[PDB]
UniProtKB/Swiss-Prot annotation, chains A, B:
Gene (UniProt): PLK1
Record's comment describing the protein's domains: The POLO box domains act as phosphopeptide-binding module that recognizes and binds serine-[phosphothreonine/phosphoserine]-(proline/X) motifs. PLK1 recognizes and binds docking proteins that are already phosphorylated on these motifs, and then phosphorylates them. PLK1 can also create its own docking sites by mediating phosphorylation of serine-[phosphothreonine/phosphoserine]-(proline/X) motifs subsequently recognized by the POLO box domains.
Resulting phenotype, residue 57 to A: No effect on centrosomal localization, nor on S-phase progression. Loss of centrosomal localization and of S-phase progression
Name of the protein: Serine/threonine-protein kinase PLK1
Organism whose genome encodes this protein: Homo sapiens
Organismal lineage: Eukaryota, Metazoa, Chordata, Craniata, Vertebrata
Whole-protein residues included: 371 to 593 of 603
Residue list for modification Phosphoserine: 5, 80
Mutagenesis / variant outcome for changing residue 170 to M: In pincer mutant; loss of centrosomal location and decreased interaction with phosphorylated CDC25C and BUB1
From Swiss-Prot, chain C:
PTM entry text: Phosphorylated by PLK1 at Thr-12, creating a self-tethering site that specifically interacts with the polo-box domain of PLK1.
Protein function: Component of the CENPA-NAC (nucleosome-associated) complex, a complex that plays a central role in assembly of kinetochore proteins, mitotic progression and chromosome segregation. The CENPA-NAC complex recruits the CENPA-CAD (nucleosome distal) complex and may be involved in incorporation of newly synthesized CENPA into centromeres. Plays an important role in the correct PLK1 localization to the mitotic kinetochores. A scaffold protein responsible for the initial recruitment and maintenance of the kinetochore PLK1 population until its degradation. Involved in transcriptional repression.
Record's subcellular location: Cytoplasm; Nucleus; Chromosome, Centromere, Kinetochore
Mutation effect (residue 12 to E): Failed to enhance the PLK1-dependent degradation
Expression (tissue specificity): Expressed at high levels in the testis, fetal liver, thymus, bone marrow and at lower levels in the lymph nodes, placenta, colon and spleen. Present in all cell lines examined, including B-cells, T-cells, epithelial cells and fibroblast cells. Expressed at high levels in glioblastoma cell lines.
Annotated phenotype, changing residue 12 to A: Insensitive to PLK1-induced degradation
Residues where Phosphothreonine is found: 12, 32
Protein name: Centromere protein U
Superkingdom of origin: Eukaryota
Protein family (similarity comment): Belongs to the CENP-U/AME1 family.
Amino acid sequence: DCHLSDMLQQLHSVNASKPSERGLVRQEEAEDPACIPIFWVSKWVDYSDKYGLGYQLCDNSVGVLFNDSTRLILYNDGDSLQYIERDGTESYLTVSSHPNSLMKKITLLKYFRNYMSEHLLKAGANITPREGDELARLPYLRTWFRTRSAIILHLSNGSVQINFFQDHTKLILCPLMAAVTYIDEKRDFRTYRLSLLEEYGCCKELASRLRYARTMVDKLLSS
Amino acid sequence: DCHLSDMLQQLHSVNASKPSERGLVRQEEAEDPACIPIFWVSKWVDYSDKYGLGYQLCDNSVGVLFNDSTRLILYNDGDSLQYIERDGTESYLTVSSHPNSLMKKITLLKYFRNYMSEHLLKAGANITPREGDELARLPYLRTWFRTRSAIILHLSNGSVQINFFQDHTKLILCPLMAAVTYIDEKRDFRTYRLSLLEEYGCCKELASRLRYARTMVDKLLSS
Amino acid sequence: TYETFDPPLHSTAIYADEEEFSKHCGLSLSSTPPG
């Protein structure tokens, strides 16, 4: 993947600079709210022992990456669907008029959708969208895996999201802008240019999660 | 039940003696430090519109009486647990055990604990516990109710505690010793034998609250 | 979602929102706070 390779180089450059080992760290100087992501994962359900992984994006669309490596996405209009086959082939349909062959996957998606709306909190609900973000192409979940410390989510647009279990912190890595959004334990949403974190430094909490992120991107490339 | 009946007879006796309508009051002679209670409610928060009532005992243990008529206690070690069902079946476990049927109730109890520790004062902080107190069986909250003027807390060891909202005075009644501990506005704690208040008299402040406590105990027995 | 639909792992549940919990606690009745 070209985007994962860029992300790795971006992360190696910042991590090699040891951004928390500075006389004076000025993390705030790296903030660039112009790099706010349009899409991130706001909810997820790991039923991979039977069906797969369901999730919600911040625009309230939902998706499922099924165990057979196909994906079904329901847009936020509640009726439009996109089906992505194992090999990435994309097709479009609706809940109202769909191939009979997708009826079971549609039903499973609705179970996931409903489980998430009834039971799960929406992450990033405090970030308000901008005009022109509604035209953005919806990404789908390309792959994911879980570690002792986090769940790693790789979206088809190139972005990598890492959700840390213990403290509910999250990283959203955008290789297209060489930027990262950090959601801290207080749910504050800050977006940084990696180049500026290298120059101006960053605190130890973010520095360590960026080392973790590099380990996870190496793993994604190994697979 | 049988402890409430004893408490009512003790309160009837003291109130019938009209202890504040004396030519001479010697309330100090009714003090008996040997009856100072082991346990009392030091903090509480009313979340009964959704979850229930969480409280802290003076030994820093935490409890909650959920709206489903069940109770869960977190001992002062920070991990041990005791879960009392509607039937009264006492089951003991730990937070480390990660029980699944109670995972949710544990999370809410921890949230009660956190709010109380960071926002609420510990009533009776000036009480230095004695030796052998740490070996006493931890009680739980059998029932409670709120009037416009006070909260009534009935513990499983038979103690009834009444906290008055406006002036922060508090009664801790112990039927086993026919005693009462009174915490005045200045947070001064005094423990008395009810029978000696009959014999030596007391101020109208304590006498009026013992009248009130009697009508509250009558309420607990009507339910 | 179906009666048999019991995901073993998932993101944070609604009840596990401690910021709303602590919030409501501040709006509800409670014992005395530090003055």
